Amino acid sequence: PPTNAERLHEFHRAIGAATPERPTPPPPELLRLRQTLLDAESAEVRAEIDHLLARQAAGEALSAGDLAPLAHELADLLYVTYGALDQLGIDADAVFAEVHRANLSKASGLKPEGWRPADVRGVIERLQHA
């Protein structure tokens, strides 16, 4: 099965948006777009969390189905976060894997003995060599 990062590549190929094979410095127009899309989805997430909190404050017993709007906006936020990494030519699964390695290993600690923080610059260097 394809990963959510590979899904963004398929979407950008389908709509003709830049999706370079390896890490590539962006034009400012790209960064501005990614900023706009991230701001929009984080505001929608916030709006749906606020709605759930207001309904709970009024004593509403939320059902699982009540979480669908928030789940949709969280997925949209995932989508535009993956989408930023994809348009930068950066394999999001490789960067996530390194952030997860650090976070998960830190949870074996405070930090454990041979603890090594995330080295995303090292991931970007390896991605440049395909």
58, 59, 74, 116: residue in contact with its own copies (rule CB under 8 A): 74
Structure tokens of 73? Answer: 């906006």
Compute how many other C-beta atoms are within 10 angstroms of the C-beta atom of residue 126.
12
Using the minimum distance from each CB to ligand UMP, give the nearer residue, 57 or 104: 104
Dist. CA 59–CA 62, nearest whole Å: 9
61 binds, among ligand UMP, Mg ion, its own copies, none (CB under 5 to 8 A by kind): its own copies
86 binds, among Mg ion, ligand UMP, its own copies, none (CB under 5 to 8 A by kind): none
Q: What share of residues in the chain are helix, strand, coil (percent, to 5)?
A: 70, 0, 30
44 binds, among ligand UMP, Mg ion, its own copies, none (CB under 5 to 8 A by kind): Mg ion
Using the minimum distance from each CB to ligand UMP, give the nearer residue, 55 or 115: 115
Compute how many other C-beta atoms are within 10 angstroms of the C-beta atom of residue 73.
20
